[PDB]
């Protein structure tokens, strides 16, 4: 066998795809945005269905989220509450954060809380000289980066199958990639088609695995 992991971002609210993923037929890691009406509960349902859970942390691109204008103190406080809000969370993922992720001061604060929680961090590859690898290597926080790309702002069932197979290429090649998809508007589409590709993955000896298992 050869391993790969899928993270599904953007849980927390009642958007398309969440019930489907939360039954736990597919081996995905659930990334919950905190402070939403159902953040805590979806986290609790994911755990009972046997799915790993991480915090999907809202950072600003180029809403008690992480903005450029926050003190280090305010950042750590916000991230501590997000972990409290998401039970079972073993790690953290960056919701967007194009700009915050080039900010050493604030990214440092974030990774310091992550370490306090003995958690890891996944760089959901929002951009292009991310500071996470460097920072997570110094502070001794396990980290890994997205490979793709499951999903997008305007994605279709076919398009998702096409990216599952790309994911498959990288996996047969043995580099243990991480795929990232989304619940939300396009979100039944990404469940359908991830689900439709499980048999093929099994057949080509690829196993889906909680992202944690593919650290350090
Ligand atoms: Zn997101």
Automatic annotation (TrEMBL):
Single annotated GO MF: metal ion binding
Residues given in the record as Zn(2+) binding sites: 9-10, 56, 95
Keywords from the UniProt entry: Metal-binding, Signal, Zinc
Biological process, per Gene Ontology: carbohydrate metabolic process
Protein name: BH1492 protein
Taxonomic placement: Bacteria, Bacillati, Bacillota, Bacilli, Bacillales
């Amino acid at each position: 066998m050869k391993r790969a992991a899928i993270i599904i971002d953007d849980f927390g609210g009642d958007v398309k795809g969440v019930d489907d993923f939360l039954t736990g037929e597919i081996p995905v890691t659930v990334a919950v945005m905190p402070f939403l009406e159902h953040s805590t509960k979806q986290a609790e349902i994911a755990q009972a269905a046997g799915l790993e859970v991480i915090v999907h942390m809202p950072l600003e691109p180029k809403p008690s989220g992480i903005t450029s204008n926050l003190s280090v103190g305010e950042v750590k406080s916000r991230v501590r509450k997000a972990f409290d809000d998401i039970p079972y969370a073993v790690g953290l993922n960056n919701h967007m954060g194009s700009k915050i992720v080039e900010n050493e001061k604030i990214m440092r604060a974030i990774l310091e809380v992550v370490k306090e929680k003995n958690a890891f961090i996944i760089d959901s590859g929002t951009s292009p000289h991310s500071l996470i690898p460097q920072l997570a290597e110094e502070l001794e926080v396990p980290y890994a980066t997205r490979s793709i790309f499951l999903d997008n702002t305007h994605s279709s069932r076919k398009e998702v199958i096409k990216n599952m197979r790309k994911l498959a290429k990288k996996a047969k090649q043995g580099s243990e990639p991480i795929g990232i998809g989304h619940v939300g508007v396009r979100g039944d589409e990404t469940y359908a088609g991830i689900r439709s590709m499980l048999d093929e993955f099994q057949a080509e000896s690829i196993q889906l695995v909680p992202v944690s298992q593919l650290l350090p």
